[PDB]
Design a protein around this ligand. Structure first.
Ligand SMILES: Cc1cc2nc3c(=O)[nH]c(=O)nc-3n(C[C@H](O)[C@H](O)[C@H](O)COP(=O)(O)O)c2cc1C
Ligand SMILES: CCOC(=O)/C(=N\O)C(=O)CC
Length: 366
């Protein structure tokens, strides 16, 4: 009896197992347009009753910090996503689109007119980190432009419109990327957010942006079609908080309150294990504390294996387990976990390259 293969009711969606495709930027969506290669890639990994989360997807022309990542802010993008969603649904899978704004984790080369990226702050990511450039070299993260509250409201509207576009494309739902030092995390983390207005200072103020984003998408598409990803403790892009557990619990409280207000539960809360990068006990403590505090479905992610995923579900630490790197190199990861079959190695060199086949769809099945 493998606990990963017991069914699970994720709100309206009846899942047949607990193995989730974690959202992974792969950079094959040339010119920000979903391509046929994405259809092949997601189709390979789809299973009947399995849940897939897409690569981060742009909500606006200013939201990108990687090359050739898809958007869902134009009608052309919606039309191409629909073809991908249809082939995934034909396999019986459930698929959510992750909505992603990078904030300050960008570069002039990724911005319209070469403008500065936006953030909560004018503080740049430090020179300890370098950004992948379209030519494969690495560049300098620039100083971002700190946005005012009118512009904050327009970014919230970008999330809302992108959620509606995702539904128009046929997605079952969306995930808010609120993790990993990206735009939402630049408001959450007190190591980044140095604002003195209503969006900074107190923990309550720092949580305002994520609350408004989640509220907007819930109001647009329904809470049961909205997942939220956060990472209160993460070593990525200078995104630290002085009190990660209290930050996490404050976010959880806002989500619990949104659910009570809306009269419905979110699809899930998705949290990255602090071990994941691009004390072992304090890390598991943080995860279980957030799970125990949240009134709903919990997806854990970051460094999971077959054994660690089985343990997480068996022990009640998570309802669903998302896998990233092993899903890159094992299109049939679900079946391999079921059979306890050996897994293929992954090649980091082709994680972010543009080839529609090599290192993308050419990892073999059993
Ligand atoms: C190539 C790659 C791209 C990723 N892109 C995203 C992304 O777009 N959005 C996101 O929330 N996480 C992203 N992550 C993190 C994954 O969703 C996931 O949490 C992580 O890979 C899980 O750890 P694992 O690889 O040990 O399974 C990415 C990870 C990898 C390896
Ligand atoms: C290390 C935490 O950050 C991530 O996992 C991530 N996006 O969220 C990427 O790596 C983008 C390619």
């Amino acid at each position: 009896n493998n606990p990963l293969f017991s069914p699970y009711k994720m709100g309206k969606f009846n899942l047949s197992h607990r193995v989730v495709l974690a959202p992974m930027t792969r950079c094959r969506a040339l010119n920000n347009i979903p391509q046929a290669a994405l259809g092949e890639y997601y189709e390979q990994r789809a299973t009947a009753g399995g849940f897939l989360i897409t690569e981060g997807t742009m909500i606006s022309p200013t939201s990108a910090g990687f090359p050739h990542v898809p958007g869902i802010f134009t009608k052309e993008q919606v039309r191409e996503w629909k073809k991908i969603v249809d082939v995934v649904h034909a396999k019986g899978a459930v698929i959510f689109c992750q909505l992603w704004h990078v904030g300050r984790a960008s570069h002039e080369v990724y911005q319209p007119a070469g403008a500065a990226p936006i953030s909560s702050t004018e503080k740049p990511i430090s020179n300890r980190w370098r950004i992948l450039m379209p030519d494969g070299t690495h560049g300098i993260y620039p100083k971002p432009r700190a946005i005012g509250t009118y512009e904050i409201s327009q970014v919230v509207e970008d999330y809302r419109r992108s959620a509606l576009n995702a539904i128009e494309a046929g997605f079952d739902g969306i995930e808010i990327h609120g993790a990993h030092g990206f735009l939402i995390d630049q408001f959450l983390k007190d190591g980044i957010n140095d604002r003195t207005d209503e969006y900074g200072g107190s923990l309550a103020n720092r949580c305002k942006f994520i609350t408004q984003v989640v509220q907007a998408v819930v109001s647009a598409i329904g809470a049961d079609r909205v997942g939220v990803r956060v990472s209160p403790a993460i070593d990525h892009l200078d995104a630290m908080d002085s009190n990660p557990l209290s930050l996490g619990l404050a976010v959880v409280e806002r989500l619990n309150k949104i659910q009570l207000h809306s009269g419905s539960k979110l699809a899930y809360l998705h949290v990255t294990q602090p071990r994941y990068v691009a004390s072992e006990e304090e890390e598991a403590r943080l995860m279980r504390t957030l799970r125990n505090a949240y009134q709903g479905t919990f997806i854990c992610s970051g460094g999971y294996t077959r054994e660690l995923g089985i343990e997480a579900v068996a022990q009640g630490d998570a309802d669903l387990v998302s896998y990233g790197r092993l899903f890159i190199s094992n299109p049939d990861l679900v079946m391999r976990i079921k059979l306890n079959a050996p897994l293929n190695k992954y090649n980091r060199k082709t994680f972010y390259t543009q080839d529609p086949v090599v290192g993308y769809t050419d990892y073999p099945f059993l």
